[PDB]
Structure 1
Amino acid sequence: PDETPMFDPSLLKEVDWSQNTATFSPAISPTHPGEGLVLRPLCTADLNRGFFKVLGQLTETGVVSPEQFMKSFEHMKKSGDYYVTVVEDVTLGQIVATATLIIEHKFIHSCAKRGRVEDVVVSDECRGKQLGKLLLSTLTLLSKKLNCYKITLECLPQNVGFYKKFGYTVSEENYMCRRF
């Protein structure tokens, strides 16, 4: 594991924060996430900073080997299409929040790009401290900057009001699943 980021950290900096609509108090931003905190791409050393401990609060992570993580990480990085983003408490050296933006390429809408928000979770001790809003507003604006024609996500009905804060609305389409 090293400090190589999954994607160019500047992409987070250069998001047009003027387009944010979510309310912050105090007014944190991608460049100013809160003292002692950094908002950045996942890097391979994050395996040892409790990345999986955070993800484990959302759903099951099973047993993951360093080699398994490295291979997944390298594939994601190589694609250019995966924006796994974390908030790290630098004083503790621990990940405290994560969210992923995935870019999908299509042929419809003039060879469009489409965004998906995945795997959004704030560590329990850090909930209600604006990090979910920060992650969501930053990644949503990043997809618009990357020329996505739309961005989508799925959530339980109890979380709908949260995502509304970044301009998401409930689609008429149903989400259908088959589990193997």
Structure 2
Amino acid sequence: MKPDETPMFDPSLLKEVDWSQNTATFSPAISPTHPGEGLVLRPLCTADLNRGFFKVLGQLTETGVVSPEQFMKSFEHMKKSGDYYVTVVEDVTLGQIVATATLIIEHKFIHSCAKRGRVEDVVVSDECRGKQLGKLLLSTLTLLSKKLNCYKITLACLPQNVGFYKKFGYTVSEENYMCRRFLK
């Protein structure tokens, strides 16, 4: 209908992550509960359409042209499933999104009907890169996936960024990542 402040998921899930199990180094110490001065770590809401969500996302990959209807349809579907955790950092002093990252829960029949996590669409605004938000997002979502009882969590990255993800307990798999982009 109209963009609003309704969160995609329960915001308490981020704060109730067992932060003692974080393995990334934070200087100064920040947490999901206290991400830094003037900042809030929270689920995406549809009103964020007008808070520079696509400006941040567009720094990572093309977002093309998006209508409010397109965005809200997509958001509502992600919300309904209960399996999408699109997470943002808002600078409340600006009223603008400065970082985002997504956790997706995928359901399986293998490993006794296991769940597995996927980390996607991670980007911190280029003007906001000294606030440790990338580490905060990855650690929080990785810990959240463990809280949600995932058997494993995976992601893809270019070689130069392997070192970053190793900080959260990820290792390079033996498996190759293969892709087909539909040109027709």
After TM superposition, the score normalised by the length of structure 1 is 0.99
Structure 1 residue 127, shift from structure 2 partner: 1.3
Q: Is the 8 A contact 2:104 2:117 kept in 1?
A: yes
Higher helix share: 1
Structure 1 residue 129, shift from structure 2 partner: 2.0
Residue ranges of structure 1 left out of the alignment (5+ in a row): none
Q: Secondary structure at the match of 2:5?
A: coil
> 2: distance between equivalents of 1:149 and 1:128?
33
> 1: distance between equivalents of 2:174 and 2:31?
32
Number of residue pairs the alignment of both structures matches:
180
> 2: distance between equivalents of 1:14 and 1:113?
20
Same amino acid, percent of matched pairs: 99
Structure 1 residue 15, shift from structure 2 partner: 0.2
Residue ranges of structure 2 left out of the alignment (5+ in a row): none
> 2: distance between equivalents of 1:126 and 1:162?
17
Which deviations, in whole Å up to 9, do the C-alpha atoms of 1:88-142 show, x marking residues without a partner? 0001000000000000000001110000000000000011320000000000000
> 1: distance between equivalents of 2:82 and 2:141?
15
Q: Secondary structure at the match of 2:127?
A: helix
Q: Is the 8 A contact 2:36 2:131 kept in 1?
A: no
Structure 1 residue 174, shift from structure 2 partner: 0.3
Which deviations, in whole Å up to 9, do the C-alpha atoms of 1:31-59 show, x marking residues without a partner? 01001000000001000000000000000
> 1: distance between equivalents of 2:21 and 2:59?
30
> 2: distance between equivalents of 1:150 and 1:6?
23
Structure 1 residue 149, shift from structure 2 partner: 0.2
> 2: distance between equivalents of 1:154 and 1:139?
15
> 1: distance between equivalents of 2:161 and 2:49?
28
> 1: distance between equivalents of 2:172 and 2:131?
25
